[model samples]
Target: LYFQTALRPYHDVLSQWQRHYNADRNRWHSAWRQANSNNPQIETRTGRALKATADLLEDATQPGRVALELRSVPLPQFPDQAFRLSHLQHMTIDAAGLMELPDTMQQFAGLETLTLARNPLRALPASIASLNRLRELSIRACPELTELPEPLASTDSGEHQGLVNLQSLRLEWTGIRSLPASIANLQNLKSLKIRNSPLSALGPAIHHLPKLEELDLRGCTALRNYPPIFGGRAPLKRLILKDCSNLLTLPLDIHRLTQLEKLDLRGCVNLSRLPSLIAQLPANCIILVPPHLQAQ
Candidate 1:
């Protein structure tokens, strides 16, 4: 009986030790798996993953850093870490399902080109105008976009206010019907393209652009009139009105556009005749006329 009792105690102690050892081993294994895991979650399609820590993004602040394209990646809301790249020159966010951009975009001091295409953005943040170095901006296929932020076209006339350095602006397949009159504030702008949109009229604010060289309004079927482009020192070189079927007449000052080099009127079936000053067009200027206006 004494032998059996002593062996029972030792057996119980051995079982207890084994249980503790197994629990400790399981805990160590779990810790190792977590430490070795790549990130919070893996991107399904591209297998891309961002580290749980923000150090990687912080490291991008190195000197001479230029551009970032976050194509088709889900991100935390208002990714402020990206804004920390102060010298980023070009940024394209395509198919990212971004509904809005953080107002901290002004932090990108040297950003020059921004393409926000194929996103569901409803409106641009007013802080976009604060990007003083921005020169080219394209917002394409954003169907939910209804209007631009007020600060973009604000007439405050304050120093460094608005898109003062913007040279090219493209808006395609959007719901915008009219542009803010303050667009004239972009005095340095040279090119503008409004394609496949529902724009109905361009107000007198257009004539104020002094250096405009290319104005493309292709596939704007709802457009009804050609705003008078006269009495201005506009150095317009290419006037593209292709597929503007509703357009009934050319601008009143068509004869004054001495600098015009190409006039694309292809698919303007309703346009029947040219103005009397058609002879003033540059001899080398190419005119693409529709079948109905070709004989006129």
Candidate 2:
């Protein structure tokens, strides 16, 4: 099956974009189903978000120029000809009572993977910083995003290459208050899920993404703050702090982080002595404490 990059067929690109303009997504998916066919609680949530976009356009089976995937379409908006699917590349729209979006969606110039989960989206679309081959931007459960669309870099005038090749910047359960002053222009940022946002502090945290690894801050209640990030070369490598309880202690040089490998501190109820960075980690990584600093 060579030269057969999986061969033949048409009528796939969203039924040829619903067979060429069934009047622009049938008046935006029948104007949200004629206003929820009369609001039975949003007609069962826009009828399961248009039956998950009719099971991927009436049961998936794409036949050509493939790579289209648009799921969960609870439209409060969206459907400007499905943004002219120029070979769309993975876009999921969850609980979409989408308040707005479509500063021409940066023309999806081969969108990488964007899931706007639970949208009540407050903003975004300074041409979304030109989506310069976006990698993955999940506003995982947007709480009407308190603030995030401010000058996402590149208002073009010279050398435009905006959003600097994003990697995996999720905004989990947001109501975001800050952090977007082009924080070091995300130099190939690795993964920084802003868990339960309203970020309070991190002024010198991760010292400007020298390629941060993974630092999800679950339930960051106004981030109290931490120490010199495990001291030496501990750049990053998954340090998820679920239920952040306003931090407590971590300055024990935790084995100089030598590329930590995941140190989750489950529901750190105001944490305790880290058993001296939990037995001095450098690979004591993949640890989880707060069972009263369990080291038994």
Candidate 2 minimal-lDDT segment of 10 residues? 7-16
User: What C-alpha lDDT, on a 0 to 100 scale, does residue 212 get in candidate 2?
Assistant: 75
Q: Could you tell me every candidate's TM-score relative to the true structure?
A: 0.76, 0.34
Candidate 1 local distance difference test against the native: 0.70
| Tens digits of per-residue lDDT for model 1, 1-296 | 56641233433433443344334433323322233345435343211322211223444566765776655443223343444577789888665455668776677777899998766677887788887789999998877787876656444535446788899999998888888777777777899999988888997658668778999999999898888765666788999999998888887578677888999999887776777677778888888899877765
Model 1 root-mean-square deviation: 15.6
In terms of TM-score, the best-performing candidate is 1
Q: What's model 2's TM-score?
A: 0.34
Model 2 spans with C-alpha error above 4 angstroms: 1-92, 96-109, 116-132, 139-164, 171-186, 194-208, 211-216, 220-243, 246-248, 253-268, 273-296
Tell me model 2's lDDT, rounded to 2 decimals: 0.63
Summed over model 2, clashes come to 0
- Backbone collisions counted per model: 0, 0
